[PDB]
Amino acid sequence: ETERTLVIIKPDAVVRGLIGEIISRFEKKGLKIVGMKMIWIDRELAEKHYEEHREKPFFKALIDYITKTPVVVMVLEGRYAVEVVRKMAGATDPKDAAPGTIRGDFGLEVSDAICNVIHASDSKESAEREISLFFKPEELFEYPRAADWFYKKG
Amino acid sequence: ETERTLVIIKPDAVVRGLIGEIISRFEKKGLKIVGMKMIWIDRELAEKHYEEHREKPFFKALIDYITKTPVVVMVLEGRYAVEVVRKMAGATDPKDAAPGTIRGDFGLEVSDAICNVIHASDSKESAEREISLFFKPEELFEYPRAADWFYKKG
Amino acid sequence: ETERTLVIIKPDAVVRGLIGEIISRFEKKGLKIVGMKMIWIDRELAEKHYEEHREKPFFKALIDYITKTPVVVMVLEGRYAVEVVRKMAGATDPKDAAPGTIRGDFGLEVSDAICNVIHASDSKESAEREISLFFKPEELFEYPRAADWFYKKG
Amino acid sequence: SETERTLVIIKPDAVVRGLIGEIISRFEKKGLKIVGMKMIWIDRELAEKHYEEHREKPFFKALIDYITKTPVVVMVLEGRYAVEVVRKMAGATDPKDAAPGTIRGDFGLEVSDAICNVIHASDSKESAEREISLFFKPEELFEYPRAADWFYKKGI
Amino acid sequence: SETERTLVIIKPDAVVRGLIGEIISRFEKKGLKIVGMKMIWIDRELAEKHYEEHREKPFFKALIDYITKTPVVVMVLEGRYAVEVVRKMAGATDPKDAAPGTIRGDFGLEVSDAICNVIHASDSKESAEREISLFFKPEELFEYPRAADWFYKKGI
Amino acid sequence: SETERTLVIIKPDAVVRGLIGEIISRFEKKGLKIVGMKMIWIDRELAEKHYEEHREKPFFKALIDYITKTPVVVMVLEGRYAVEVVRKMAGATDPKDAAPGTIRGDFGLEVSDAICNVIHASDSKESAEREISLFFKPEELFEYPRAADWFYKKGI
Ligand SMILES: Nc1nc2c(ncn2[C@@H]2O[C@H](COP(=O)(O)OP(=O)(O)O)[C@@H](O)[C@H]2O)c(=O)[nH]1
Ligand SMILES: Nc1nc2c(ncn2[C@@H]2O[C@H](COP(=O)(O)OP(=O)(O)O)[C@@H](O)[C@H]2O)c(=O)[nH]1
Ligand SMILES: Nc1nc2c(ncn2[C@@H]2O[C@H](COP(=O)(O)OP(=O)(O)O)[C@@H](O)[C@H]2O)c(=O)[nH]1
Ligand SMILES: [Cl-]
Ligand SMILES: [Cl-]
Ligand SMILES: [Cl-]
Ligand SMILES: [Cl-]
Ligand SMILES: [Cl-]
Ligand SMILES: [Cl-]
Ligand SMILES: [Cl-]
Ligand SMILES: [Cl-]
Ligand SMILES: [Cl-]
Ligand SMILES: [Cl-]
Numbered sequence: 001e002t003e004r005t006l007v008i009i010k011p012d013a014v015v016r017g018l019i020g021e022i023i024s025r026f027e028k029k030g031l032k033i034v035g036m037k038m039i040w041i042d043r044e045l046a047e048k049h050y051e052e053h054r055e056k057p058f059f060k061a062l063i064d065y066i067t068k069t070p071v072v073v074m075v076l077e078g079r080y081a082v083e084v085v086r087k088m089a090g091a092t093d094p095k096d097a098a099p100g101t102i103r104g105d106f107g108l109e110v111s112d113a114i115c116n117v118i119h120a121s122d123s124k125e126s127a128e129r130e131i132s133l134f135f136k137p138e139e140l141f142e143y144p145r146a147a148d149w150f151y152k153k154g
Numbered sequence: 155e156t157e158r159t160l161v162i163i164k165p166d167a168v169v170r171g172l173i174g175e176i177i178s179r180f181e182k183k184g185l186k187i188v189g190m191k192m193i194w195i196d197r198e199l200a201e202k203h204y205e206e207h208r209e210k211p212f213f214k215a216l217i218d219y220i221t222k223t224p225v226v227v228m229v230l231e232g233r234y235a236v237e238v239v240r241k242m243a244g245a246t247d248p249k250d251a252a253p254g255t256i257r258g259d260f261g262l263e264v265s266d267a268i269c270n271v272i273h274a275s276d277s278k279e280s281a282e283r284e285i286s287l288f289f290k291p292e293e294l295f296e297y298p299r300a301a302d303w304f305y306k307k308g
Numbered sequence: 309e310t311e312r313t314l315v316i317i318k319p320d321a322v323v324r325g326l327i328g329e330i331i332s333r334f335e336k337k338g339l340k341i342v343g344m345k346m347i348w349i350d351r352e353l354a355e356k357h358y359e360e361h362r363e364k365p366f367f368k369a370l371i372d373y374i375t376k377t378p379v380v381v382m383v384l385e386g387r388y389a390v391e392v393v394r395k396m397a398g399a400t401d402p403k404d405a406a407p408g409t410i411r412g413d414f415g416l417e418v419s420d421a422i423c424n425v426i427h428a429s430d431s432k433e434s435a436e437r438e439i440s441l442f443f444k445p446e447e448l449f450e451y452p453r454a455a456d457w458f459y460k461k462g
Numbered sequence: 463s464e465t466e467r468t469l470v471i472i473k474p475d476a477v478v479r480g481l482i483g484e485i486i487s488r489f490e491k492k493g494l495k496i497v498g499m500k501m502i503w504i505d506r507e508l509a510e511k512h513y514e515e516h517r518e519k520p521f522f523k524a525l526i527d528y529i530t531k532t533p534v535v536v537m538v539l540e541g542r543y544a545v546e547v548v549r550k551m552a553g554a555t556d557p558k559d560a561a562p563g564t565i566r567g568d569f570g571l572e573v574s575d576a577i578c579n580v581i582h583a584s585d586s587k588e589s590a591e592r593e594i595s596l597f598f599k600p601e602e603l604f605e606y607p608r609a610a611d612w613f614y615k616k617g618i
Numbered sequence: 619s620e621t622e623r624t625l626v627i628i629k630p631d632a633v634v635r636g637l638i639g640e641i642i643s644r645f646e647k648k649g650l651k652i653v654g655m656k657m658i659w660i661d662r663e664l665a666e667k668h669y670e671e672h673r674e675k676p677f678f679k680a681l682i683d684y685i686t687k688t689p690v691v692v693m694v695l696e697g698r699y700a701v702e703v704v705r706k707m708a709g710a711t712d713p714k715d716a717a718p719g720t721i722r723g724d725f726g727l728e729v730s731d732a733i734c735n736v737i738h739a740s741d742s743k744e745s746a747e748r749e750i751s752l753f754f755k756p757e758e759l760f761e762y763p764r765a766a767d768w769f770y771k772k773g774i
Numbered sequence: 775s776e777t778e779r780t781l782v783i784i785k786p787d788a789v790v791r792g793l794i795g796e797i798i799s800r801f802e803k804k805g806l807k808i809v810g811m812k813m814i815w816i817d818r819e820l821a822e823k824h825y826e827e828h829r830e831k832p833f834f835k836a837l838i839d840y841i842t843k844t845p846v847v848v849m850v851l852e853g854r855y856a857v858e859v860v861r862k863m864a865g866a867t868d869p870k871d872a873a874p875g876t877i878r879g880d881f882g883l884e885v886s887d888a889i890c891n892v893i894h895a896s897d898s899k900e901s902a903e904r905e906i907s908l909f910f911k912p913e914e915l916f917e918y919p920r921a922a923d924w925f926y927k928k929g930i
């Protein structure tokens with residue numbers, strides 16, 4: 001049931017100084033950070049990441065948004081991590097996101113793009129693809145978090 | 155899409171020392187405080203604010219409640235601020251409010267009135283009316299919050 | 309409307325150092341701690357507490373889980389405390405729990421048992437029974453919390 | 463008695479950065495009572511009056527520009543030895559020197575031509591009295607019970 | 619070894635104000651282990667025994683009234699040099715003098731006839747030993763692993 | 775100018791305990807800018823190079839074992855007098871001595887054969903320069919605006 005998912009702490013979150021608060025929510029949930037780095041995405045990489053939206057009217061604005069400033073890309077590992085992180089993220093448009101979710105508590109204002117604090121892979125398949133776009137195997141680690149032993153079935 | 159809504163941090167919140175925590179939730183969401191002051195509402199002003207409830211059985215108790223101690227009235231500005239703040243507030247009766255919402259996390263106990271931490275305008279129209287009841291134009295301001303520039307479409 | 313409910317801060321929460329954070333959520337909601345103690349539940353007591361699950365496939369694992377390390381048993385008092393605490397706890401399986409709830413924010417990983425941070429009585433009847441299992445009348449108290457006077461109808 | 467009132471100004475840097483709530487919560491958590499509060503936009507005349515004791519100091523101009531840059535939140539805190547206590551909570555004038563745990567220590571660092579330091583706290587009972595009068599009318603200050611006030615009642 | 623056990627009492631003011639959780643979290647976050655804990659309502663005999671060293675001091679009576687005002691939460695914290703560490707976390711006896719960041723510094727200020735100061739922390743290993751015995755039976759103290767205990771294992 | 779860059783390492787104890795976010799938030803809240811950051815697993819060669827000044831010290835071996843125990847998060851913080859400021863935020867080397875409010879003061883205590891102390895902070899501008907180079911390539915460090923940067927613009 002253990003899966004890996006890719007999360008991008010977007011430019012709006014970085015500029016607003018919310019990196020730590022976002023990371024803490026994942027750590028507190030029990031999710032493990034197995035990879036992470038601050039990078040500045042270029043248009044080519046951005047369009048590959050968001051290839052599914054190439055023919056949508058907001059594509060250009062979305063690429064401008066994700067490449068506006070550096071972002072923090074990270075890989076989270078844990079039981080059903082993909083669906084869990086999507087649940088934690090909340091609705092795409094922050095105004096519709098429920099209080100308690102990341103977008104619900106931190107997002108609201110938008111530009112030409114629907115600024116929404118973070119990106120979260122939408123499926124195990126997508127996560128695999130996205131993780132490969134931003135990380136090399138040598139940047140992903142296997143190590144124990146403090147409470148790992150507690151759940152070991154002997 | 156930018157709107158203004160009126161919020162009243164009720165006597166129960168003031169007495170319990172929750173003013174700051176409530177304000178922080180709005181600031182963290184990205185909402186801008188364009189007006190704010192601690193006042194002690196008298197019955198006349200209270201009945202004008204809650205005119206819609208004049209013929210309800212809980213009217214008297216509600217007026218007693220809102221005028222019990224000083225309150226903090228404030229105007230919040232932001233994208234769809236009215237519906238967003240209502241969403242953040244949660245169900246009228248705190249016991250029914252979802253965890254994560256203001257009433258959900260802070261409210262529960264009631265008196266003869268359903269004490270519920272805060273008041274939030276229910277519509278743009280109501281907000282306009284309520285804002286006018288408590289504030290003069292000279293008490294409302296236009297200024298930039300730190301991240302405002304980020305969302306400017308050039 | 310004032311009720312008492314039993315909550316058990318389970319071994320996973322104790323080991324992870326989440327006792328305080330869990331307690332704070334209840335205090336902030338307005339709930340009153342009328343009884344509380346750290347104990348180490350033995351199998352006999354554990355099976356009495358979870359008697360309803362005796363014929364379920366996960367029974368053995370559940371008993372192992374709840375008796376793994378000491379836990380903190382506590383009695384919470386307040387308006388509709390039973391349903392309110394259940395609401396605050398969230399879905400049984402933490403991966404399904406909504407962000408904002410205790411299980412939603414803190415739980416995810418599981419062992420042979422569905423580790424979910426806390427236990428909360430499912431009804432007033434169950435609460436009565438469970439409270440009696442862990443506490444003697446002399447361990448339960450009646451005292452005023454700071455804001456109690458605020459809600460007194462004269 | 464030991465109960466005093468002091469003036470706090472949540473400065474433009476704090477307002478712009480969205481720290482109003484976090485600052486207020488620190489005072490509420492300490493047990494201090496907010497007896498008056500409002501968001502205002504200080505004009506140069508009022509700013510220079512508040513900081514008149516620095517009228518003949520080199521940093522005066524930058525200070526006025528800073529305090530009047532955007533709206534601020536002025537408030538009056540009441541409580542046991544509130545003046546010295548709030549000053550202690552504020553921390554060293556230059557935030558880089560302020561101890562972690564203090565308001566300036568946890569939230570301040572960067573400066574403009576002025577030493578931006580998150581908040582203002584009256585330095586003495588005499589200054590508190592003068593400052594409260596500059597920003598608040600008696601009609602804007604209130605006497606009411608905070609939840610735990612009854613717990614501290616002395617004598618019988 | 620360096621591992622010690624100390625006694626902490628979350629006093630009536632903290633309980634009434636709903637600060638039990640916040641106080642416990644500070645100890646958990648520090649890495650201290652809670653090996654015993656319970657809510658009890660201290661009677662005068664036990665209160666006077668705990669504070670026997672102040673038996674002949676003017677504030678004694680007010681102190682007993684205060685500590686027995688409502689139920690409290692007594693707990694035993696275990697960890698490296700726990701006695702001095704918890705004392706440091708507590709801060710100065712009179713909360714108005716306690717540094718921001720400490721428990722008394724962030725949460726205490728107001729007083730009654732007694733100097734209400736949020737919590738009690740054993741002042742020495744000798745006092746800790748005596749105090750733990752007054753409130754806890756060995757059967758109420760436990761040895762178990764906290765999540766990160768394995769990380770600190772020494773030697774091979 | 776007064777703007778400096780310093781190197782911070784969120785050590786294995788912090789990573790294992792899930793404190794990465796809380797530590798980063800303290801720097802963000804202070805107003806410091808993260809210009810570089812990544813999770814890496816330090817090897818003995820790099821660890822010994824970073825701590826070369828302790829090459830001939832008794833605790834060296836335990837120190838290397840500790841810093842290479844699990845992955846860490848290295849990051850570069852930029853801001854006014856960042857070196858001394860971050861050091862101040864970190865607190866005393868041995869967490870038991872660190873003041874409440876500091877990172878080590880609030881989060882550290884227990885030790886292994888090494889004095890586990892949550893994070894590493896460059897001790898000087900010279901050390902910061904050397905350390906940043908050991909862990910980061912210029913291509914991994916960025917210049918960008920944080921939300922409030924405009925507020926502090928000096929002069930006209
Ligand atoms: N301007 C604009 N941007 C959008 C819209 N929908 C989505 N976006 C942006 O494009 C991103 C990706 O879209 P999508 O995958 O559908 O949403 P997500 O998976 O929840 O992030 C969203 O997170 C927004 O940043 C839209 O309708 N208009
Ligand atoms: N006693 C009592 N008070 C109520 C009841 N419904 C609402 N109230 C109080 O009256 C306030 C205004 O009512 P309403 O506008 O319907 O709810 P709101 O807009 O969510 O605050 C509520 O916030 C409560 O303070 C009720 O059924 N009984
Ligand atoms: N292994 C396993 N454990 C379960 C399952 N369902 C429940 N549990 C565990 O048994 C406890 C009690 O079950 P139940 O009363 O139905 O859920 P609760 O009232 O929400 O705690 C749950 O909290 C879990 O700890 C399950 O389907 N499989
Ligand atoms: Cl949502
Ligand atoms: Cl963990
Ligand atoms: Cl709701
Ligand atoms: Cl902002
Ligand atoms: Cl749920
Ligand atoms: Cl209360
Ligand atoms: Cl200081
Ligand atoms: Cl209070
Ligand atoms: Cl101190
Ligand atoms: Cl731990």
Ligand SMILES: [Cl-]
Binds near residue numbers: 866871872873876879
């Ligand atoms: Cl220190």
Ligand SMILES: [Cl-]
Binds near residue numbers: 015016
């Ligand atoms: Cl910023």
Ligand SMILES: [Mg+2]
Binds near residue numbers: 120122
């Ligand atoms: Mg998507």
Ligand SMILES: [Mg+2]
Binds near residue numbers: 274276
């Ligand atoms: Mg209404």
Ligand SMILES: [Mg+2]
Binds near residue numbers: 428430
């Ligand atoms: Mg059940």
